[PDB]
Design a binder for this molecule. Structure first.
Ligand SMILES: NC(=O)c1cccc(N)c1
Lengths: 190, 197
């Protein structure tokens, strides 16, 4: 449904390799090279997953209504191993597969570039650029299974995400499916 | 939002007490009493949760497209403790908080075909006033297989295509008595039955 997606022959899922030197590739490469200029990019792919996008956009609309502002989305990074890539492309990020038991996303590509996250393949590494509905956030802590409530006497009204540091966040954790949309996959080497 | 819901003015959540003798109440009562005739219903509430409904209906439409038929949905029961009711009413069922079943077919949220299963004190734990609580739930069971205790998602239909998954798992494919779901917004809590011995 986004305007910049290309035609999919009436299908619902496609990975589209970006053309180097065009505006879309350049924009994503720049976000990566801001902190990972010593790495070599092999390719960048746009993830066109209609079902995942639809469920994510429903959640975004709901969060925009609940927070009655539209500053709920951030573009973050997520490094993972090659064996998780097919699952993420098709199903997104699953907390069931410390600041809480959720899925973690980094502000800086350099954080996700650590081998503990983007585990090397032939030494190929994989990192997603992710639209994340961080919404209203608070500091996380170990053992959380959802974000904390905003106020005790209303324990069901929750923060949207948690972070390591509210003033200068470097990571965010989300605890529900469809709060994160994998937008691009970067394949790269050290 | 469904046309039979009460108008919520500009609200996104409401519980609606049903009246006995109407078909909506009586049919839920009949489904419950089919296996829970020793218990007595205090009340039945319709759960009107706009956001949960929207996200669930999106998943249902997607599953109906994927499976190329239209019986992916079952009406099942879920007994729980009073302390979980506010959360479920607002946020639905969360696999990360789910109880461990006495016979585990995976790490997910469990739903019963028969109210008698959910009526056990192990699940619908009596509160300090003797009230037990059971949800009636639209569940997207889709295509299913027999589960296994280690599962954190449904298994693949084919081991050589690991991402093409069953929609849910069960205890027994020939005579299913319980279903386990592993994703958010795959189950919509539609009614809450409050009942007693
Ligand atoms: N890239 C990751 O998987 C990641 C991002 C932020 C924090 C953590 N722990 C991991």
């Amino acid at each position: 449904l986004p305007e910049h997606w290309t035609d999919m022959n009436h299908q619902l899922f496609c990975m589209v390799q970006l053309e180097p030197g065009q505006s879309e590739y350049n924009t994503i490469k720049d976000k990566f090279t801001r902190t990972c200029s010593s790495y070599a990019i092999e390719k960048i792919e746009r993830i066109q997953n209609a079902f995942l996008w639809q469920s994510y956009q429903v959640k975004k609309r709901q969060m925009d209504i609940k927070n009655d502002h539209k500053n709920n989305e951030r573009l973050l990074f997520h490094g993972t191993d090659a064996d998780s890539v097919p699952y993420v492309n098709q199903h997104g990020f699953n907390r069931s597969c410390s600041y809480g038991k959720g899925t973690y996303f980094a502000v800086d590509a350099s954080y996700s570039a650590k081998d503990t996250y983007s585990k090397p393949d032939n030494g190929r590494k994989h990192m997603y650029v992710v639209r994340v509905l961080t919404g209203v956030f608070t500091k996380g802590r170990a053992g959380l299974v959802t974000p904390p409530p905003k106020n005790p006497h209303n324990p069901t009204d929750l923060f949207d995400s948690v972070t390591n540091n509210t003033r200068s966040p470097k990571l965010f954790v989300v605890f529900f499916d469809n709060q994160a949309y994998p937008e691009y996959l970067i394949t790269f080497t050290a």
